[PDB]
Amino acid sequence: YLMEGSYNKVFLAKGNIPAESYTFFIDILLDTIRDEIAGCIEKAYEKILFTEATRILFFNTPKKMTDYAKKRGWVLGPNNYYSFASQQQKPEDTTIPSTELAKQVIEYARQLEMIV
């Protein structure tokens, strides 16, 4: 379930444990789930109101997200949350590729002329 995105089952299993409460570990998973869920939603999506993210996992209307938003981004606006991802300024460059490419071709020349 963790390997794929299926998480609604994880909380369903969180309430069904074979040995005992096992809460000494489920608390550990909380760190490995919420951090992942926030990261996924961090992509270049549009505004998401504080109504889906609030009542989604287990809680109705807590203050955790307020802290959650504070340590993450999600700039606060007119009930407007943004998640912008460009990854476009960095790409589209060959000067750095130029040095890598120059080494590459020289190796072709190196291993084409000199005797090994």
């Binding site: 080494k103 020289i106 190796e107 020349a109 190196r110 002329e113």
Partner: protein
């Protein structure tokens, strides 16, 4: 004044600086190009004028110091690309 990177003089940005209306800057750019004094193209869709070569002028004693900087930042770049080939092509030499 504009760095070679931008050089995207908009129609409005030219009329304001020369005291012309927007619907007349077109005859100005052609006049400059006709004499042979600037080179570029005109794009009347986004209202932009490209410039590629402004005729050289005189630089008293400070823009010439800056010209020295652009050669230092360029000689050192060419220098690095020389030893890069010389070091990774040691076998292919002599």
């Amino acid at each position: 004044t504009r760095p070679a990177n931008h050089r995207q003089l908009t129609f409005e940005e030219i009329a304001k600086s020369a005291k012309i209306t927007v619907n007349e800057v077109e005859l100005l750019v052609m006049k400059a190009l006709s004499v042979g004094l600037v080179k570029g193209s005109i794009d009347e869709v986004d209202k932009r004028v490209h410039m590629t070569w402004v005729q050289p002028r005189v630089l008293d004693l400070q823009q010439i110091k800056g010209m020295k900087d652009r050669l230092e930042f360029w000689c050192t770049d060419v220098k690095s690309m020389e030893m890069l080939v010389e070091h990774q092509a040691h076998d292919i030499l002599t």
